[PDB]
């Protein structure tokens, strides 16, 4: 979620990802932990086996074969963590994640009940404004002369500088509001 | 294979701001600054203002508005058995015929 994806997965990434998928599905069939441990070690035997085959034209043919084998022995209903995509708690609290900007419409009589939270907030709104100009400038200075771009972002290279485009990450609502 | 040095340096900086943000969300001791029996008087005023008083109004409505209009309350005729004495006319229902008697 935090890291933007690359342009394309390498062979190394496509095999590790399969490895994790194939174990999680094994655990879905086995259930029992002792039985899940036994077959998880057999699974690693099948991945250590062709670990070094560096043909790079049969390694691929060993992956498409293994994905087509995974897709046939899927669990029709794998276990999912409650907060993960497809999970039962997935996005349960998204109705409680009010953006911080909604406080900017609060009535004064509402703001009068939290005088010290609302004072540590005008500092953050100042810090955000003074930092903005220097953030925009830094992002042009690192705009590579060749258009090739990636979703990643640069840090603060100086002192007294916050990393550019930091407000929507730092201020984001809590995972469990 | 993992974070690049510039990647790892951005996380340090954001993570620093982030935790300084969540700390700011904590409430001071004095917030919010609001502007101002087990079966007795606690349990009397409930069963005497949600059961008794509402029953006076519901009874008043039933007794003088529903039971004084035609066919508003219509009940099944009560079962009458061979042997009963009818509370109105005084009639007595004749007893039944006679059973040959049985035992399982």
């Amino acid at each position: 979620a935090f890291c933007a994806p690359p342009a394309y997965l390498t062979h190394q990434q496509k095999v590790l990802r399969l490895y994790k998928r194939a174990l999680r599905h094994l655990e879905s069939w086995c259930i029992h932990r002792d039985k899940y441990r036994y077959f998880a070690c057999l699974m690693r035997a099948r991945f250590e086996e062709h670990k070094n085959e560096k043909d790079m034209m049969r390694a691929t043919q060993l992956l498409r074969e293994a994905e087509e084998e995974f897709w046939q022995n899927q669990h029709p209903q794998p276990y999912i963590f409650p907060d993960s995509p497809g999970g039962t708690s997935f996005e349960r609290y998204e109705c409680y994640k009010v953006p911080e900007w909604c406080l900017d419409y609060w009535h004064p009589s509402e703001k009068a009940m939290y005088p010290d939270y609302f004072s540590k907030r005008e500092q953050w709104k100042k810090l955000r404004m003074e930092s903005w100009d220097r953030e925009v400038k830094q992002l042009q200075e690192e705009t590579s002369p060749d258009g090739i771009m990636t979703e990643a972002l640069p840090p603060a290279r100086r002192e007294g500088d916050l990393p550019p485009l930091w407000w929507h990450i730092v201020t984001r609502p809590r995972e469990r509001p | 294979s993992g974070y690049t040095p510039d990647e790892k340096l951005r996380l340090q900086q954001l993570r620093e701001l982030r935790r300084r943000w969540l700390k700011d969300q904590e409430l001071s001791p004095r917030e919010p600054v609001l502007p101002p029996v087990f079966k007795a008087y606690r349990s009397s005023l409930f069963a005497v203002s949600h059961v008794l008083i509402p029953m006076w109004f519901v009874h008043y409505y039933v007794k003088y508005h529903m039971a004084t209009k035609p066919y508003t309350i219509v009940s099944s005729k009560p079962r009458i058995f061979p042997g009963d004495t009818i509370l109105e006319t005084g009639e007595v229902i004749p007893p039944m015929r006679d059973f040959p008697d049985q035992h399982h």
Partner: peptide, 12 residues
């Protein structure tokens, strides 16, 4: 610790 809860302006 008690945390602040961001809410919409309910005053209105």
């Amino acid at each position: 610790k008690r945390l602040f809860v961001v809410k919409p302006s309910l005053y209105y």
